[PDB]
Copies of this chain bind each other. A is one copy, B any other.
């Protein structure tokens, strides 16, 4: 009864001070929406990030979840790959299924 369609889902983990840079990249590519998980902690190649220890909550690591059509993955990584060469963080690309492609594509 409810048809499912393929989509991609990015999990972008980075320092909160770079939130605007990441969301601007998403908005420019035509990404329709995103969800942000705040105050994260994590282990990186050069030390620990402890969200609870930050004096400014906006400085803690964040995870931006963005469901995007496959066509947007390439242009998005063109922007994110060079950012990650200069700053901490990672992007994980997932395959997902959604019920409403029009909510995610245009």
Q: How far is the CB of A105 from chain B (nearest CB, A)?
A: 13
Residues of A that sit less than 8 Å from B by CB: 1-2, 4, 7, 9, 11, 13, 23, 27, 31-55, 61, 63, 65, 67, 73-74, 77-78, 81, 84, 90-101, 103
A-B pairs with lowest CB-CB distance, top 3: A33-B44, A93-B97, A35-B42
Q: Which residue of B lies closest to A6 (CB)?
A: B93
Q: How many copies does the complex hold?
A: 3
CB distance A32 to B44 under 8 Å? yes
Q: How far is the CB of A38 from chain B (nearest CB, A)?
A: 6
Alpha-carbon distance between A45 and B78 when the two chains are bound, in angstroms: 24
CB distance A81 to B41 under 8 Å? no
